[PDB]
């Protein structure tokens, strides 16, 4: 009995944040999107043209085509029991660069730097980041102070 409208259920999704209405800041238009880079589809409602569908709000994809005002994004969509890589045309107002890719390329560059430097100076170094290891043994000093004795408080009705 639900309608099939393109913007059904997007009352808060496409609405602007509190006290963030008005002119779209221009640095969003000044971003450079190459083919193959990773973008996050958000979809502000100020610009009604080139809007993504509500099923792509919050999804992340890879740019494959660049036009004057929009980009082509390959984004995975799950439909029933299959995931298919949809291709969507979204104006640049509704996307932004994904920081996870930036962090990963920074890590790759730093790892290559470490490899080159370590090969120059011979000493092996660890690159594969490890999960949080168990805490090692250590001494906890008292500094001549008795640890405070804690007792549960008696019950009383407050309000």
């Amino acid at each position: 009995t639900n309608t099939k409208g393109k913007r059904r259920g997007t009352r808060y999704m496409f609405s602007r944040p509190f006290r963030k209405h008005g002119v779209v800041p221009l640095a969003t238009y000044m971003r450079i999107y190459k083919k193959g880079d990773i973008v996050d589809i958000k979809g502000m409602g100020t610009v009604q043209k080139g809007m993504p569908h509500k099923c792509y709000h919050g999804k992340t994809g890879r740019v494959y085509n660049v036009t004057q005002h929009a980009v082509g994004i390959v984004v995975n969509k799950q439909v029933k029991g299959k995931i298919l890589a949809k291709r969507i045309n979204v104006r640049i107002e509704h996307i932004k660069h994904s920081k996870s890719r930036d962090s990963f390329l920074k890590r790759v560059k730093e790892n290559d730097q470490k490899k080159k430097e370590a090969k120059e100076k011979g000493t092996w170094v660890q690159l594969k980041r490890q999960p949080a290891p168990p805490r090692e043994a250590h001494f906890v000093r008292t500094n001549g102070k008795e640890p405070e004795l804690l007792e549960p408080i008696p019950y009383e009705f407050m309000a």
């Binding site: 805490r135 906890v140 008292t142 008795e146 640890p147 405070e148 804690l150 007792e151 549960p152 008696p154």
Partner: protein, 175 residues
């Protein structure tokens, strides 16, 4: 929390050192638990109730059993506790006689279960204290403060009712 014969554990914990306080304060509690694992769990429960600590953001630096320093001496234990009934929370003060502190706390748990149907997870023991005989308030305890205490064992019920199961003589209850 189930039960058994409880033991007293001195559990000491603290927050993890963070670059806001490099030496967080150490805190100490007396936990009466069947074993040290339950003692650690109850310590975290209580210090989460009191301070803003969690098992994840803190550590336990000591968890050792507190041996009774006079298990050969009879003494009076006063216990302050709170528990949740079926329709509210109540603070109670109860008195018991035992050689050991943890024995008196176990007595308290059994007695709360017997009289108030209070399961052990509802009961919060907030102070256990040895009290002098002149500071006792419960008549059930004060009647044992007699240097010339004297009573018989009036009606001794046979307990060996199955050895023998059949016999000619009817048992005697006066001894």
């Amino acid at each position: 929390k189930a039960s058994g014969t409880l033991r007293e554990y001195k559990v000491v914990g603290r927050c993890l050192p963070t670059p806001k306080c490099h030496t967080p304060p150490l805190y100490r509690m007396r936990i009466f638990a069947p074993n040290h694992v339950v003692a650690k769990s109850r310590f975290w429960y209580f210090v989460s109730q009191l301070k803003k600590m969690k098992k994840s953001s803190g550590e336990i630096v000591y968890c050792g059993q507190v041996f009774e320093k006079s298990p050969l001496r009879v003494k009076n234990f006063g216990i302050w506790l709170r528990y949740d009934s079926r329709s509210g929370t109540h603070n109670m003060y109860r008195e018991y006689r035992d050689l050991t502190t943890a024995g008196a706390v176990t007595q308290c748990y059994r007695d709360m279960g017997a009289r108030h149907r209070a399961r052990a997870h509802s009961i919060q023991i907030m102070k256990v204290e040895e009290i002098a005989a002149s500071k006792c308030r419960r008549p059930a305890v004060k009647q044992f403060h007699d240097s010339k205490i004297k009573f018989p064992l009036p009606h001794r019920v046979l307990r060996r009712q199955h050895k023998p199961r059949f016999t000619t003589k009817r048992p005697n209850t006066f001894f």
